[PDB]
RNA sequence: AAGGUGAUAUGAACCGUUAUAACCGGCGAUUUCCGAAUGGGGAAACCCAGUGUGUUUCGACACACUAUCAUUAACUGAAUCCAUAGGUUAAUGAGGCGAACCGGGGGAACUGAAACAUCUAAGUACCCCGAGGAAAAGAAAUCAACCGAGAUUCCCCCAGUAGCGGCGAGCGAACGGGGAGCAGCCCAGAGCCUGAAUCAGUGUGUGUGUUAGUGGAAGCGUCUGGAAAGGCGCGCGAUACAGGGUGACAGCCCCGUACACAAAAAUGCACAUGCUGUGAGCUCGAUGAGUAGGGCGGGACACGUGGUAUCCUGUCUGAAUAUGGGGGGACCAUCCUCCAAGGCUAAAUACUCCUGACUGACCGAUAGUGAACCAGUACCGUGAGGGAAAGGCGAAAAGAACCCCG
RNA sequence: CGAACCGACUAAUGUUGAAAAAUUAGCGGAUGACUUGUGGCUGGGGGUGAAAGGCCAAUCAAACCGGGAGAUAGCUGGUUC
RNA sequence: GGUAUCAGAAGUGCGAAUGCUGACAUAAGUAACGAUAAAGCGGGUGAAAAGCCCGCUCGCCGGAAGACCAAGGGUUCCUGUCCAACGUUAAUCGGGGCAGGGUGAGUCGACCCCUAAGGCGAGGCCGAAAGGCGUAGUCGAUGGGAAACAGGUUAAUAUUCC
RNA sequence: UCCAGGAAAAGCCUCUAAGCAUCAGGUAACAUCAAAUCGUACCCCAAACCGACACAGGUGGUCAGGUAGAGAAUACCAAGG
């Protein structure tokens, strides 16, 4: 494929937020704490290869941590990348283990 | 430094228990020395706020010095101060000024 | 009334601070100075 | 700021009066240009006196002879 | 080398005990983005392209190169035959930081003179350029005084003398003497001989340092006390009783300690070497012209034009050329001494961002660094910039289970 | 003529304020040499100025910051058993 | 931990300098609690309610004292919690503390094409050095270039999700 | 209608140069793929911004209901606060 690139590790880690199964119509989606860096496309293919799902679009986004945390009083902020990815219907989570 | 590794039966020195016996230990290097004759009844309290809110009122460790009563074979103390010679190829630990390795 | 401040970024490079002290010999002379002597943390630029 | 052939001048000084001025002196010599090369034909050097009197004993050639080599 | 996964906090999950677990030292591998920042741009850590690439489910991902100058090389190449100007490519190289000492270009004022212009402060402050480990200077157109010394540099004297100076304030030598250090050589050119000494960059080796380390002595008893290193009794080491640490002050408990060993590798300096370039040595030659002087204007010489030698010069002139030319404090004669217009050079001398060891009739939290502590932080300012407060439970966390008021 | 908007003639209050120049009631201009957002350009003996030495960051008969610097102070204060 | 003695060397002796730093007084439990758009009551919670939540009244603003955005701010947003310090009082409450959660775009904006003022500027012209000016050219919005609406929904997103 | 006579460049349309020369390209229809990356929370005439303050001050643009009224005055009200 033209997986060249970074396909590797575009994706990691899930959410379990507020969002998570409130979020389920036609069409679960997901989260992922997917790289500060792993655009839109690459992130459609993650899920491609591995997961073995469907994914329809992409969004993502960036959220921005912030707190003070010091010896004394410095401390600052964290950053991330949200993304939620849409997938399809005809196909669930079927054999996997859900967390 | 230490060279005292652990099961090192050793013996109080300095004060306090003095002349006891203990063994083993859990001296490390630059760390810390439990031997086994050095420990006073303490106290725990009930850190884990959960529903197994111990303790641990007895036993523990009271550090002290290396400085304990050397090794020691037949008396006491017995300088290991001194360097075996051709045995191992890491070490090669001596011991007291009495015989030769042991 | 108005007070003399008013802020704006972008009123803050080739104007005033940011980056553009590297573009004059005393421009870039302030950073050795400020940076080196008495390490700084310096912040400039936002 | 020239002369080229010669190294030049622009040093300071100070113009005193009658006794004294701390003020200060200095840029001199001059220019002139379009100087024809016995070869092809002339660059135009910005040479000055002591510059132009030094073609003369010399070269044109010599003189020029530096401005290359070095 | 028996432990170990940096710190404020364990804890979890673990790696190790024999010899590839840690940990220390050497050589490497990797090393995002910004920053000389260099592909172009840009409010610094962001934005956009060209041209090549591999894997390619063969759009792509990222990668890699592409700044500007200078030297050389080749190719292209205008007005104009030529030729240049210009252009392209390529290999080298530079570029930026940097504490002080150092050379150099530019250069104050407060101040003092009990006012102030000369004069001083001071060629200091500062700003700019450059280079080294030191730089700079340096083998007499030096000085001396009819005797002679013999490159530069740094030290003590000569002397607060001579002299300069609104002869005010103040500035302030040298000859000569005692020392540290101590070497002189190249081109200005041909021939003979002919790769010879001398250096420079480099691969190598040896010495001796730098970067981990190794061994390293000799004490029991009893007393007081929570605790013994202290009291008292006796005993031993000492090329080691520097020092630190240990539950009160220890040579003999621990780290060390004198002394004695030690380096795959990597480098400093030395010597030695090979390679490359250099070019020795002999003969016979050559001997630094817009220069020396000088007129005008200035600056430098302790010397403020003074009678002012000498040095550098902005500006304008301009010679002899070794039976010739400079100097010897106006200047002339005589005598003496030395060859200027070309260049290189170790050492003694200077300085401290930093390195390791060590020392102190130096401070001990209002001291000593601004800072003994997550300090150039918090703060304050548009900014440059300014710039804090803040140490100590105990030997041991044994940091107070549990109970009671709330 | 008169709102917005721009400006400040008068009085009271405030004067350790609500405020390091304002509040309240009046007041002048309000299609113009008008008024305002954003960004840019002039630098200290220098700028800008329908001119008052006005303005140049609560600073202006010569800005702020750092330096020469411990300027100088025939003056004032203070000077320990 | 200290140090007769005799000797040695001083950051050698404070009450003042509108001295410097810190601590604590005084006035004094005095003034003041920030627009004169005043609030009453019943429940709830709670150790406690004039102030918080619920409800009914009442009053105030409405070219706004409403709504949206830019500038600037940089989690102040929503939920749960806790009330030391911070709120000029109390505080169970908050823009306070500690946790979590929360901003989803081919059509909106920035990037991005384009250029203004102006900036920078190969080579170049000047200038003791630093550096000034500027040709090609390259940046620079506050201006010109292409395309979406209406319902719905979240505790909090919305011409982004359906 | 007037005098003070009122940016620029790109996109866009069009015309050709060199070049192309059964080709490529151009126009239209539809089929499909692509449209990356940042911002988006909340305050915003204010308790989140400039004023040391939960400060009677300052801060650009947009929207513009009913009765009355010349009206963005003013008074009482909507939505809302």
Same mark, same amino acid.
């Given at each position: ?11 990691? $880690? ?8 409130? $979020? ?16 839109? $496309? ?11 799902? &469907? ?33 399809? &219907? ?8 859900? $967390? | ?66 400085? #304990? ?28 000024? #009495?015989?030769?390795?042991? | ?6 802020? /704006? ?5 080739? /104007? ?28 400039? /630029?936002? | ?12 000084? !100070? ?36 510059? !132009? ?18």
């Amino acid at each position: 494929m033209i997986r060249e690139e970074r396909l590797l590790k575009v994706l990691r $880690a899930p959410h379990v937020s507020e969002k998570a199964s409130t $979020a389920m119509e036609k069409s679960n989606t997901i989260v992922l704490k997917v790289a500060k860096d792993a655009t839109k $496309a690459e992130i459609k293919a993650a899920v491609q290869k591995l997961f073995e799902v &469907e994914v329809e679009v992409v969004n993502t986004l960036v959220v921005k941590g912030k707190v003070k945390r010091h010896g004394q009083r410095i401390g600052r902020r964290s950053d991330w990348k949200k993304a939620y990815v849409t997938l399809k &219907e005809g196909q669930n989570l079927d054999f996997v283990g859900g $967390a | 430094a230490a060279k005292i590794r652990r099961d090192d039966e050793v013996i109080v020195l300095t004060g306090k228990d003095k002349g006891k016996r203990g063994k083993v230990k859990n001296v490390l290097s630059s760390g810390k020395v439990i031997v086994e004759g050095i420990n006073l009844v303490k106290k725990h309290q009930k850190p884990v706020p959960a529903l197994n809110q111990p303790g641990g009122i007895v036993e523990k460790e009271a550090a002290i010095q290396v400085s #304990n009563v050397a090794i020691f074979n037949a008396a006491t103390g017995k300088a290991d101060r001194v360097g075996f010679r051709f045995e191992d190829g890491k070490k090669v630990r001596f011991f007291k000024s #009495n015989s030769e390795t042991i | 009334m108005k007070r003399t401040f008013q802020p /704006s970024v972008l009123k803050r490079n080739r /104007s005033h601070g940011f980056r553009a002290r590297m573009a004059t010999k005393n421009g870039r002379q302030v950073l050795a100075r400020r940076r080196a002597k008495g390490r700084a943390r310096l912040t400039v /630029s936002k | 700021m020239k002369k080229d052939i010669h190294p030049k001048y622009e040093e300071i000084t !100070a113009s005193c009066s009658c006794g004294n001025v701390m003020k200060i002196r200095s840029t001199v010599g001059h220019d002139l240009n379009l100087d024809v090369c016995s070869k092809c034909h002339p660059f135009f050097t910005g040479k000055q006196r002591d510059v !132009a009197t030094g073609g003369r004993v010399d070269r044109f050639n010599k003189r020029f002879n530096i401005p290359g080599s070095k």
